[PDB]
Short mmCIF file of C-alpha atoms and ligand atoms in Angstrom, two decimals:
data_model
loop_
_atom_site.label_atom_id
_atom_site.label_comp_id
_atom_site.label_asym_id
_atom_site.label_seq_id
_atom_site.Cartn_x
_atom_site.Cartn_y
_atom_site.Cartn_z
CA UNK A 1 193.86 333.92 3.19
CA UNK A 2 192.14 331.67 0.65
CA UNK A 3 188.81 331.57 2.34
CA UNK A 4 186.56 332.90 -0.55
CA UNK A 5 187.18 329.54 -2.36
CA UNK A 6 186.15 327.49 0.49
CA UNK A 7 182.82 329.00 0.82
CA UNK A 8 181.77 327.97 -2.71
CA UNK A 9 183.09 324.25 -2.04
CA UNK A 10 180.49 323.80 0.82
CA UNK A 11 177.53 325.16 -0.65
CA UNK B 1 183.67 299.96 -23.72
CA UNK B 2 182.52 299.59 -20.02
CA UNK B 3 179.41 301.56 -18.85
CA UNK B 4 180.78 302.04 -15.33
CA UNK B 5 182.75 304.55 -17.42
CA UNK B 6 179.49 306.01 -18.56
CA UNK B 7 178.17 306.08 -14.99
CA UNK B 8 180.76 308.88 -14.60
CA UNK B 9 181.17 310.11 -18.10
CA UNK B 10 177.45 311.39 -18.45
CA UNK B 11 177.63 312.26 -14.85
CA UNK B 12 180.62 314.26 -15.48
CA UNK B 13 178.81 315.95 -18.19
CA UNK B 14 175.46 317.33 -16.83
CA UNK B 15 177.91 318.96 -14.44
CA UNK B 16 179.46 320.60 -17.66
CA UNK B 17 176.29 322.24 -19.09
CA UNK B 18 174.61 322.59 -15.63
CA UNK B 19 175.63 326.26 -15.72
CA UNK B 20 176.43 328.82 -18.66
CA UNK B 21 177.45 332.35 -18.47
CA UNK B 22 174.55 334.60 -17.36
CA UNK B 23 173.52 336.91 -20.33
CA UNK B 24 173.35 339.70 -17.78
CA UNK B 25 177.11 339.12 -18.19
CA UNK B 26 177.49 337.99 -21.64
CA UNK B 27 175.43 340.32 -23.07
CA UNK B 28 177.68 343.18 -22.09
CA UNK B 29 180.20 342.20 -24.57
CA UNK B 30 177.74 343.85 -27.01
CA UNK B 31 175.74 346.29 -25.08
CA UNK B 32 178.68 348.40 -23.44
CA UNK B 33 181.47 350.43 -24.64
CA UNK B 34 184.70 349.57 -26.12
CA UNK B 35 187.37 350.89 -24.07
CA UNK B 36 190.63 349.12 -22.52
CA UNK B 37 188.90 349.76 -19.28
CA UNK B 38 185.43 348.31 -20.23
CA UNK B 39 187.24 345.59 -22.07
CA UNK B 40 189.07 344.62 -18.99
CA UNK B 41 186.16 344.80 -16.70
CA UNK B 42 184.02 342.75 -18.88
CA UNK B 43 186.92 339.97 -18.98
CA UNK B 44 187.01 340.39 -15.10
CA UNK B 45 183.25 340.04 -14.79
CA UNK B 46 183.43 336.97 -17.08
CA UNK B 47 186.23 335.19 -15.53
CA UNK B 48 185.11 335.68 -12.02
CA UNK B 49 181.95 334.46 -13.18
CA UNK B 50 183.86 331.48 -14.66
CA UNK B 51 185.45 330.73 -11.48
CA UNK B 52 182.41 330.38 -9.60
CA UNK B 53 180.67 327.50 -12.21
CA UNK B 54 184.23 326.10 -12.23
CA UNK B 55 184.16 325.41 -8.57
CA UNK B 56 180.44 323.91 -8.76
CA UNK B 57 181.49 321.55 -11.48
CA UNK B 58 184.87 320.42 -9.78
CA UNK B 59 182.91 319.59 -6.39
CA UNK B 60 180.59 317.26 -8.73
CA UNK B 61 183.69 315.24 -9.75
CA UNK B 62 183.61 311.84 -8.67
CA UNK B 63 185.77 311.73 -5.19
CA UNK B 64 186.94 315.40 -5.35
CA UNK B 65 185.27 316.15 -1.99
CA UNK B 66 186.92 313.05 -0.47
CA UNK B 67 190.08 314.99 -0.75
CA UNK B 68 192.53 316.56 1.40
CA UNK B 69 191.07 320.24 1.78
CA UNK B 70 194.62 321.70 1.75
CA UNK B 71 194.72 320.11 -1.65
CA UNK B 72 191.44 320.98 -3.31
CA UNK B 73 192.71 324.51 -3.03
CA UNK B 74 195.97 323.97 -4.68
CA UNK B 75 193.90 322.05 -7.40
CA UNK B 76 191.99 325.09 -8.24
CA UNK B 77 194.52 328.09 -8.03
CA UNK B 78 196.82 326.15 -10.50
CA UNK B 79 194.31 324.92 -13.05
CA UNK B 80 191.64 327.96 -13.08
CA UNK B 81 193.53 329.76 -15.70
CA UNK B 82 193.90 327.03 -17.88
CA UNK B 83 190.31 325.73 -17.61
CA UNK B 84 189.09 329.16 -18.42
CA UNK B 85 191.11 328.84 -21.52
CA UNK B 86 189.50 325.62 -22.51
CA UNK B 87 185.90 326.92 -22.15
CA UNK B 88 186.52 329.83 -24.31
CA UNK B 89 188.32 328.05 -26.93
CA UNK B 90 185.10 325.86 -27.03
CA UNK B 91 183.02 329.28 -27.54
CA UNK B 92 185.63 330.44 -30.32
CA UNK B 93 186.08 327.17 -32.18
CA UNK B 94 182.45 326.11 -32.29
CA UNK B 95 181.73 330.19 -32.21
CA UNK B 96 178.99 329.83 -29.95
CA UNK B 97 176.63 332.67 -30.36
CA UNK B 98 176.29 333.13 -26.35
CA UNK B 99 179.91 333.90 -26.16
CA UNK B 100 180.24 336.33 -29.05
CA UNK B 101 183.43 335.09 -30.41
CA UNK B 102 184.49 337.76 -32.98
CA UNK B 103 183.66 340.51 -30.30
CA UNK B 104 185.03 338.72 -27.38
CA UNK B 105 188.44 338.51 -29.27
CA UNK B 106 188.84 342.30 -29.75
CA UNK B 107 187.90 342.98 -26.07
CA UNK B 108 190.89 340.99 -25.25
CA UNK B 109 193.33 342.44 -27.55
CA UNK B 110 193.04 345.90 -26.19
CA UNK B 111 192.95 344.84 -22.68
CA UNK B 112 196.45 345.95 -21.79
CA UNK B 113 197.68 342.73 -22.75
CA UNK B 114 201.04 342.59 -24.01
CA UNK B 115 200.99 341.44 -27.84
CA UNK B 116 203.65 339.16 -26.63
CA UNK B 117 200.88 337.18 -24.99
CA UNK B 118 198.03 338.05 -27.26
CA UNK B 119 199.68 336.32 -30.02
CA UNK B 120 200.40 332.67 -28.89
CA UNK B 121 197.13 332.82 -27.18
CA UNK B 122 195.37 332.87 -30.48
CA UNK B 123 197.88 330.71 -32.00
CA UNK B 124 196.15 328.18 -29.39
CA UNK B 125 192.58 329.51 -30.03
CA UNK B 126 192.68 328.61 -33.65
CA UNK B 127 195.08 325.51 -33.05
CA UNK B 128 192.48 323.84 -30.85
CA UNK B 129 189.46 324.37 -33.24
CA UNK B 130 190.85 322.23 -36.12
CA UNK B 131 190.61 319.17 -33.83
CA UNK B 132 186.75 319.94 -33.91
CA UNK B 133 186.75 318.57 -30.24
CA UNK B 134 183.38 317.22 -29.02
CA UNK B 135 181.77 318.34 -25.85
CA UNK B 136 182.86 314.97 -24.18
CA UNK B 137 186.57 315.86 -25.12
CA UNK B 138 186.12 319.55 -24.08
CA UNK B 139 184.52 318.22 -20.81
CA UNK B 140 186.83 315.37 -20.01
CA UNK B 141 189.86 317.48 -20.83
CA UNK B 142 188.43 320.04 -18.38
CA UNK B 143 188.10 317.60 -15.48
CA UNK B 144 191.45 316.11 -16.07
CA UNK B 145 193.31 319.54 -15.90
CA UNK B 146 191.62 320.06 -12.72
CA UNK B 147 192.30 316.78 -11.52
CA UNK B 148 195.99 317.36 -12.22
CA UNK B 149 198.60 316.02 -9.53
CA UNK B 150 201.32 317.93 -11.06
CA UNK B 151 200.56 321.40 -9.84
CA UNK B 152 202.18 323.22 -6.97
CA UNK B 153 201.70 322.80 -3.19
CA UNK B 154 200.15 319.12 -3.36
CA UNK B 155 200.95 316.84 -0.49
CA UNK B 156 199.09 313.61 -1.65
CA UNK B 157 199.41 313.81 -5.51
CA UNK B 158 198.78 309.80 -5.48
CA UNK B 159 195.14 310.36 -4.45
CA UNK B 160 194.60 313.12 -7.22
CA UNK B 161 195.75 310.52 -9.97
CA UNK B 162 193.49 307.88 -8.48
CA UNK B 163 190.63 310.09 -9.81
CA UNK B 164 192.19 311.45 -12.79
CA UNK B 165 193.16 308.30 -14.28
CA UNK B 166 189.87 306.75 -14.69
CA UNK B 167 188.75 309.76 -16.55
CA UNK B 168 191.96 309.54 -18.57
CA UNK B 169 190.98 306.00 -19.63
CA UNK B 170 187.44 307.13 -20.44
CA UNK B 171 188.87 309.73 -22.52
CA UNK B 172 191.13 307.11 -23.91
CA UNK B 173 188.45 304.82 -24.68
CA UNK B 174 186.51 307.63 -26.50
CA UNK B 175 189.09 308.49 -29.10
CA UNK B 176 188.80 304.89 -30.30
CA UNK B 177 185.10 304.76 -31.25
CA UNK B 178 184.44 308.30 -32.23
CA UNK B 179 187.47 308.31 -34.40
CA UNK B 180 189.32 305.21 -35.38
CA UNK B 181 191.19 305.58 -38.64
CA UNK B 182 193.74 307.21 -36.47
CA UNK B 183 194.81 305.79 -32.97
CA UNK B 184 197.10 308.96 -32.16
CA UNK B 185 194.26 311.33 -31.54
CA UNK B 186 194.13 310.63 -27.79
CA UNK B 187 197.68 312.10 -27.20
CA UNK B 188 197.21 315.05 -29.34
CA UNK B 189 194.47 316.06 -26.81
CA UNK B 190 197.16 315.47 -24.17
CA UNK B 191 199.52 317.99 -25.82
CA UNK B 192 197.05 320.72 -25.35
CA UNK B 193 197.39 320.04 -21.49
CA UNK B 194 200.90 321.21 -21.82
CA UNK B 195 200.20 324.10 -24.08
CA UNK B 196 198.04 325.41 -21.35
CA UNK B 197 200.89 325.11 -18.86
CA UNK B 198 202.97 327.03 -21.20
CA UNK B 199 200.13 329.80 -21.28
CA UNK B 200 199.76 329.33 -17.29
CA UNK B 201 203.52 330.76 -17.23
CA UNK B 202 202.83 333.47 -19.58
CA UNK B 203 199.36 334.54 -17.78
CA UNK B 204 200.94 335.10 -14.29
CA UNK B 205 203.13 337.79 -16.13
CA UNK B 206 199.87 339.24 -17.78
CA UNK B 207 198.48 339.51 -14.33
CA UNK B 208 201.48 341.61 -13.16
CA UNK B 209 201.48 343.60 -16.27
CA UNK B 210 197.98 344.47 -15.21
CA UNK B 211 198.28 344.80 -11.48
CA UNK B 212 201.19 347.30 -12.33
CA UNK B 213 199.19 349.64 -14.62
CA UNK B 214 196.51 349.60 -12.03
CA UNK B 215 193.99 346.99 -13.46
CA UNK B 216 192.21 345.50 -10.60
CA UNK B 217 190.42 342.19 -9.86
CA UNK B 218 187.61 340.75 -7.83
CA UNK B 219 188.62 339.20 -4.30
CA UNK B 220 187.85 335.74 -5.76
CA UNK B 221 190.42 336.35 -8.46
CA UNK B 222 192.73 337.98 -6.29
CA UNK B 223 192.58 334.85 -4.14
CA UNK B 224 192.70 331.95 -6.55
CA UNK B 225 195.94 333.84 -8.08
CA UNK B 226 196.89 335.56 -4.94
O1 LIG C 301 178.51 332.54 -23.21
C1 LIG C 301 178.89 331.63 -22.57
O2 LIG C 301 178.05 331.05 -21.70
C2 LIG C 301 180.35 331.36 -22.12
C3 LIG C 301 180.89 329.91 -22.07
C4 LIG C 301 182.11 329.70 -21.92
N1 LIG C 301 182.99 330.67 -21.34
C5 LIG C 301 182.61 331.94 -21.25
N2 LIG C 301 183.49 333.06 -20.87
C6 LIG C 301 184.74 332.95 -21.82
C7 LIG C 301 185.51 332.74 -20.66
O3 LIG C 301 186.37 331.55 -20.98
C8 LIG C 301 186.30 333.73 -20.12
C9 LIG C 301 185.74 334.87 -19.40
C10 LIG C 301 186.51 335.94 -19.01
C11 LIG C 301 187.88 335.73 -19.12
O4 LIG C 301 188.64 336.95 -18.46
C12 LIG C 301 189.97 337.10 -19.56
C13 LIG C 301 191.22 336.87 -18.63
C14 LIG C 301 192.22 336.08 -18.98
C15 LIG C 301 192.42 335.34 -20.31
C16 LIG C 301 192.55 335.93 -21.47
CL1 LIG C 301 192.68 337.70 -21.64
C17 LIG C 301 192.69 335.23 -22.93
C18 LIG C 301 192.41 333.87 -22.79
C19 LIG C 301 192.44 333.16 -21.58
C20 LIG C 301 192.39 334.04 -20.37
CL2 LIG C 301 192.25 333.03 -18.70
N3 LIG C 301 193.18 336.02 -18.01
O5 LIG C 301 192.91 336.92 -17.13
C21 LIG C 301 191.40 337.49 -17.24
C22 LIG C 301 190.74 338.45 -16.57
C23 LIG C 301 189.97 338.53 -15.51
C24 LIG C 301 190.16 339.72 -16.16
C25 LIG C 301 188.53 334.63 -19.87
C26 LIG C 301 187.78 333.73 -20.06
CL3 LIG C 301 188.54 332.41 -21.14
C27 LIG C 301 184.51 332.32 -19.72
C28 LIG C 301 181.15 332.22 -21.66
#
């Protein structure tokens, strides 16, 4: 849940 | 007044232009067919794309990365809708040629959106045009909407404001040098913040109206809106 969002914040 | 505002002002704003919508995408508003299906597909293609650049932009906001991570999500999931709105108003009001204003509107009207939600949306789309907002006013307002401590599911709202308040004051500073014959401009911009909220209410229902008739989204959109 809500983990596609976390991959764009760590790029 | 106070460049220290401008150390972050300009800094807020090469973040703002740093990405536009790829014209592999935006030149589909023209090149493709006009059906409620394709209308909705492009809008999806564009809102999803817009989520990506939105995240990029948000990450470059002074002190955002420093925040609690359980809140950085909450900030985005509540404001993404409204931030999309601002960036398309810009597109329509300035009538930018990369956004294809006149055509983008019609794709939206036949997208399976109730005319109940269609109407107040263009009541706004116009409404924000006459302000003839500068890019700084479209940009600062976007950063302020993202950095909003009144969203749902935030634990430390105090820290969020500690980063919104500068940009507010920078915004406040701005409406006194560009336009001085009327001091009440700064809080007409701040009224659009509340209209977008009123739209964030209506949108969640547009979403269900869609999910109801089988209109599907990206895993990104399905995640930012659950
Ligand atoms: O040409 C450019 O470079 C550019 C610049 C700025 N914005 C661009 N597009 C317009 C844009 O703001 C946008 C792109 C797609 C988009 O989708 C429509 C939409 C909306 C919506 C509608 Cl229909 C009307 C007003 C506001 C919204 Cl968020 N809500 O959900 C959705 C969907 C996924 C399917 C809504 C918007 Cl506002 C991003 C493109």
